[PDB]
């Protein structure tokens, strides 16, 4: 019984079998996956969706599927994922987002994130939500700072689930706490 969340334009909902085709197309898109190690095949796409469903089943929240009523059934995901890996800022909850390029430049990731963080702070009453990306992924960390999240460059970290010499290992960390979120 996953709780659906509404924004002006977006419905943040549980994933459905019919989303897997659309999400597979996104995951096969080199523009969507530019700042990730590689594009995913259908098998790898479906495996990510399985982890999302598992997260929802365990925690009652997760990276929500993004529906746009009056327009499109599925445009990607935005939502929360518990951080359990061996990093300095664990344990905590992260926020992440992936949109079909057709829906870029419309403030839809912004709106989805505002809906997710409202849930995070008003409903779950989390003390903090984090987000991390690579320096070249400016669309991603641009959104983080526009949402009012803030980065300390001293908190730059090597991702523990990548090789020690991996060229995409260096990540930057953004944080927003309940006070900062309530204040903006
Ligand atoms: C990261 C990502 C979600 C950002 O999406 P986005 O559409 O650029 O983000 P926003 O929702 O903040 O939209 C901002 C843009 O829309 C505009 N905008 C913002 N609010 C708006 C509104 N209410 N109405 C109209 N336009 C609006 C802004 O001017 C901006 O345009 P610009 O980027 O050309 O300057 C998207 O690029 C993506 O999915 N990237 C690939 C996957 C990825 O790397 N994810 C992150 C992994 S760490």
Author numbering: 9 to 192
Paper text:
Since our kinetic studies showed the enzyme utilized a ping-pong or hybrid ping-pong mechanism, we attempted to obtain a crystal structure of the protein with S148 acetylated. All of our previous structures of the enzyme were determined in the presence of CoA. Therefore, we co-crystallized the protein in the presence of AcCoA and looked for density around S148 for an acetyl group. In addition to adding AcCoA for co-crystallization, we also included (R)-3-(2-chloroacetamido)-4-(((S)-1-methoxy-1-oxo-3-phenylpropan-2-yl)amino)-4-oxobutanoic acid. While this compound was present in the crystallization solution, it was not observed in the crystal structure; the rationale and synthesis of this compound as an alternate substrate will be described in a separate manuscript. In the presence of these compounds, the enzyme also crystallized in the P1 space group with two molecules in the asymmetric unit. Based on the observed electron density, we modeled CoA in chain A and AcCoA in chain B. In this structure, we did not observe any additional density around S148 that would indicate its acetylation in the crystal. However, we did observe a very small amount of AcCoA cleavage in the presence of the enzyme and absence of acceptor substrates in our kinetic assays, possibly indicating the enzyme could form an acyl-enzyme intermediate required for a kinetic mechanism with a ping-pong component. Further studies are necessary to show the acyl-enzyme intermediate is indeed formed but are beyond the scope of this current study. This structure was nonetheless useful for docking experiments. Therefore, we first docked NANMO into the WT structure with AcCoA to determine which residues might interact with the protonated and free base forms of the molecule.
Enzymes in the Gcn5-related N-acetyltransferase (GNAT) superfamily are widespread and critically involved in multiple cellular processes ranging from antibiotic resistance to histone modification. Previously, we determined the structure of the PA3944 GNAT enzyme from Pseudomonas aeruginosa and found that it could acetylate polymyxin antibiotics, specifically the 3-Dab residue on polymyxin B and on colistin. The canonical chemical mechanism attributed to GNATs is a general acid/base mechanism; however, mounting evidence has cast doubt on the applicability of this mechanism to all GNATs. This study shows that the Pseudomonas aeruginosa PA3944 enzyme uses a nucleophilic serine residue and a hybrid ping-pong mechanism for catalysis instead of a general acid/base mechanism. Instead, PA3944 has a serine (S148) in a comparable location as the typical critical tyrosine residue found in GNATs.
